Symmetry: D2
Subunit: 297 residues, 4 copies
């Protein structure tokens, strides 16, 4: 009973290094036999491709069979821009964006089409919010919209532009976080807002794309990624610790765990699953109180 | 056991006529004894104030005691603009916006402050989406963001700017729709996305403003407003009919019904209710199938 | 804008003293003008009626207008028994049950019918679980079923037996707790199970009774009732403290607050609300983490 | 990327033939390499074992590799009875129950222990409700409790009795249905109530068993199983048709699809998933209206 993706091709948007969920999903898909295409934010491109060439991610490339994951092709991408006429002189002129081309959503998709003709799986793993450290009460309109634009609408855009080249019976997957449904202080700047939109859009697009092209659309509501800090300071480290203490099962979350869930979800085994929010968070989401609250000892 | 708002002052954003939820909430609040301030979109200002002066809304102004609702003051407002420096030459120059002033969120709030010094209740009843008739797959980034900007962020802005002049123990209320949580075909253009953000923001702001100033924050997920069309054609009319046939209780929804729920929710009787999504939709939301599906007869 | 219940009659199941939610709802309804009938567990009957006669609840009977609530009639009731033939020699023979009569659901309802002919409002406020202090893993079948029987099915029974004498446009209300949807350690013995059934039944009965007799059916998911203990020890006291520290709004919950929500919900103002779970818990339910977790300071 | 269950042993409660979800899960687990133990209702035992011996299920035993699934051992079981002293003379005396032994939960578990020493996976796939065709308003207490007893508490009992012999890092899975959360007319007799309890218990037991023994606990909310009837008449056939017309993806549901989801969920790949309700229903659950409602054409 294999999760069998041989002969399938995946486009993964949002890989800049070997430390996030994106890399983790690519690894699982690669283990399952899929051919891997990567969309890399174009300010990150250089250092990513360089490190890769120098062998800097080689330990991170190790698959379960001992082989090394191969990235078939890296495509620069900036998912806040749909087509070339949407780019400001401003941005077009910066060194980084100056160095590369075809990085708008419309352009990348046309390149993939030219290069490979089709894809089966679309993975969205990018998010960005300039004011993420501010409470909503202190978030500016511009900051709020930027977060929505890069973290929610970018999925709509990707799907929409790639759909014509996706083979029916294919699928997409995005990553979400509980802050959309529950109050998580510290997840600011409209990022909670953006995750709420992404989840709602997942359901709507499951209908639109399911009926239109027989494509499945789901999202994974993941917990904090990694092991405990010696001294937790900062949002993430703090949530890692919180989760470890308070989840129904006491353990940390590994990239593996998220990547394997994704692999299953974009595979044919998951043929009856669509418009779904799958919790891959050690069951934290189900808890009604914090076990470590001082009231309880 | 009265819902007693005597001595309290309400600012209602989103009233352009006597046909929407906004007017309905104002009427209930007025019946309860609140003093009514209105924020009117500034392209609508003229015709609104004129009709009001001509007595065109007099039948609609009738309260339960036979008296007529009084609007203490109408303030022009355009809630997609926070301060004056955010307005484009473009918009500032149009006849309509040219005719009035202090219509940015920052300006209206400062005016209310000058005029009355304080408010107790904030009602958000405005929404707007240029591409509402398009499926997500066909919605542009600009159209999607516009909907978010006018329908979600406008609440954050209002709350944030008014908070300093809200008396503790006061409250706010917004209006939402099920499309945020479930698939409703035809509710396009990112309006479903925007309602999802608004709901998520309600919870977050209940925390932020509750802790900061002891202000309650809730939203009402309302159904389609009005009685059945002779021939339902168009989104709304069609949903009216759908709901009537398929809700647990077979009836239409009246403005009354939404306005009374709101009045209760912003009153002191509701002192233990905050961050909540209250369904005022004849229980449609709870149904798992459509009773009128041809499979069932 | 009154919540006006004059001329309406309420039957409140589950009042044994002046300390629970039941008493609180009766008080609100009474303030609103309803005529109050009470269903008292028959092992509690004596001490309840005695205290009442001695004036022991007089301070608790004080309504907002300074007047004293009147209980029109107290009916003994044991809601785990539907009709007389369901009672065991066992129970029929005990002193307490021996002392009174017509205490089965079928019998009480027939008495109310004989006495008053009709009712408008039904309040369910009884729960009982022999093994509530045990984890599920340690709960016996008998203990689990007992909890379901007294805390869930008793509502089905009451509604079903009273429905024929309820005036259309009337309503019912029950009390629930978050343990149904989220993990609350310490709420054992199948009581969480029972609250989950009660909530699900609320929705189903909103459909059944709404279509059948135009009766609204809702439930209130309340938080822990009362102020903080000097030294919180025991489930309730501990949750009181937890909630106070961790809710979006920092305060305790008073009976008042629950009773006022109920009064609104069974009134004509709430005519578009049915099959609903209304959170009256200071917004605790919306929180995604405990603010007092040691990880956060 | 295999879903690898080699060396693992599963106990599947609720297999009486090759037509339900139970058989479907057994097949997937078997494909993944697990060793299969079956718990068969003891009135069904005979015909099940006979058919199996005659080769009547041989076509249904076909796995993806062309091999035939092997059932290592069939154990009679009646999950409404925990131990022998709970059985009535009544039942003990019937021909069927007379023919076999060790069929109480306590007894089967002790037998498995004796036979194999341990298990890794527990599957619950049994449900039963004497009054399933009646509305709640017409369901008797006895009928309601029977449904709860066989469909909810039976999972608590199984888990509790087997836990001591489950290897840490093992898992359990049950089957649920949307009627728990939404109104599904026709799913009567307290079966909706029972599914609500089962779901709530899943979360609670994920906490109890996760902390106690590092066991994962999840449930699958499945849709109607099978292809369309020539003439849909009867609950199931009707829901099959409803779902096909109205799900985001237009297709039927196959046993396969449910079995594969289960296999994944009880495997080590799903190590970060617990207390979860996974929808395997072609995304029906996400829809906010029926597409086939006559209002929409
Ligand atoms: N609490 C949580 O669990 C949580 C919170 C936020 C986001 N996420 C998810 O995590 C993933 C992000 O990866 P990560 O957090 O492990 O590391 P990360 O910070 O690197 O993830 C963001 C990724 O998006 C890319 N990106 C940013 N702006 C972009 C743009 N305009 N165009 C293209 N790419 C852009 C970054 O280069 C990076 O690869 C996303 O799927 C995100 O959705 C989870
Ligand atoms: N399906 C549903 O139930 C549904 C769908 C959408 C919105 N709503 C809610 O209904 C209310 C809208 O009133 P309605 O639908 O009865 O009629 P409506 O169309 O007049 O409501 C929109 C209101 O917002 C105002 N508005 C639009 N753009 C604005 C801007 N930039 N600045 C200021 N005001 C602006 C309009 O003038 C109007 O008063 C809002 O609370 C909205 O949130 C419900
Ligand atoms: N965590 C929570 O918020 C929580 C937990 C459980 C129950 N509740 C709700 O609280 C209410 C209970 O009142 P309370 O907790 O304030 O005090 P309480 O303990 O007195 O409430 C239980 C009531 O039910 C009655 N009762 C018990 N068994 C009965 C039977 N077989 N027949 C008839 N009556 C019977 C009792 O006499 C009493 O009046 C109920 O509505 C219950 O549903 C809330
Ligand atoms: N709408 C839905 O999707 C829906 C509705 C109900 C149940 N289910 C699930 O479906 C599964 C049932 O299998 P199915 O519906 O495909 O066919 P089925 O009717 O055969 O399933 C019930 C199974 O439980 C067994 N059973 C009944 N009473 C029992 C008892 N007292 N002790 C032991 N075993 C007993 C039966 O022999 C049978 O194997 C269960 O997991 C059930 O939970 C789904």
């Amino acid at each position: 009973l294999p999760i069998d993706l041989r002969g399938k091709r995946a486009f993964i948007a949002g890989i800049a290094d070997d430390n996030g969920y994106g890399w983790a999903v690519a690894k699982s898909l690669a283990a399952a036999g899929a051919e891997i295409l990567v969309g890399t934010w174009v300010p990150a491109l250089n250092i990513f491709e360089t490190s890769l060439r120098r062998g800097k991610f080689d330990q991170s490339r190790v698959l379960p069979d001992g082989s090394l994951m191969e990235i078939k092709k890296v495509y620069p991408l900036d998912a806040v821009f749909d087509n070339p006429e949407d780019v400001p002189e401003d941005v077009k002129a910066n060194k980084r964006y100056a160095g590369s081309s075809n990085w708008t959503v419309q352009e990348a998709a046309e390149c993939v089409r030219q290069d490979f003709g089709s894809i089966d799986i679309l993975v969205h793993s990018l998010a960005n919010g300039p004011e993420v450290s501010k409470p909503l009460l202190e978030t500016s309109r511009k900051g709020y919209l930027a977060a929505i634009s890069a973290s929610s609408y970018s999925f709509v855009s990707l799907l929409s532009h790639f759909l014509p080249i996706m083979n029916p019976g294919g699928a997409s997957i995005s990553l979400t976080y509980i802050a959309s449904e529950r109050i998580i202080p510290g997840y600011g700047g409209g990022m909670s807002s953006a995750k709420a939109a992404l989840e709602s859009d997942t359901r709507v697009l499951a209908f639109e794309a399911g009926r239109k092209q027989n494509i499945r659309v789901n999202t994974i509501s993941a917990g904090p990624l990694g092991s405990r800090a010696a001294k937790a300071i900062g949002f993430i480290d703090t949530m890692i610790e919180y989760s470890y203490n308070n989840a129904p099962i006491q353990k940390t979350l590994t990239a593996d765990e998220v990547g394997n869930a994704a692999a299953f979800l974009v595979s044919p085994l998951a043929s009856a699953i669509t418009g779904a929010t799958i919790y891959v968070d050690n069951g934290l989401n189900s808890m009604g109180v914090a076990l470590d609250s001082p009231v309880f000892k």
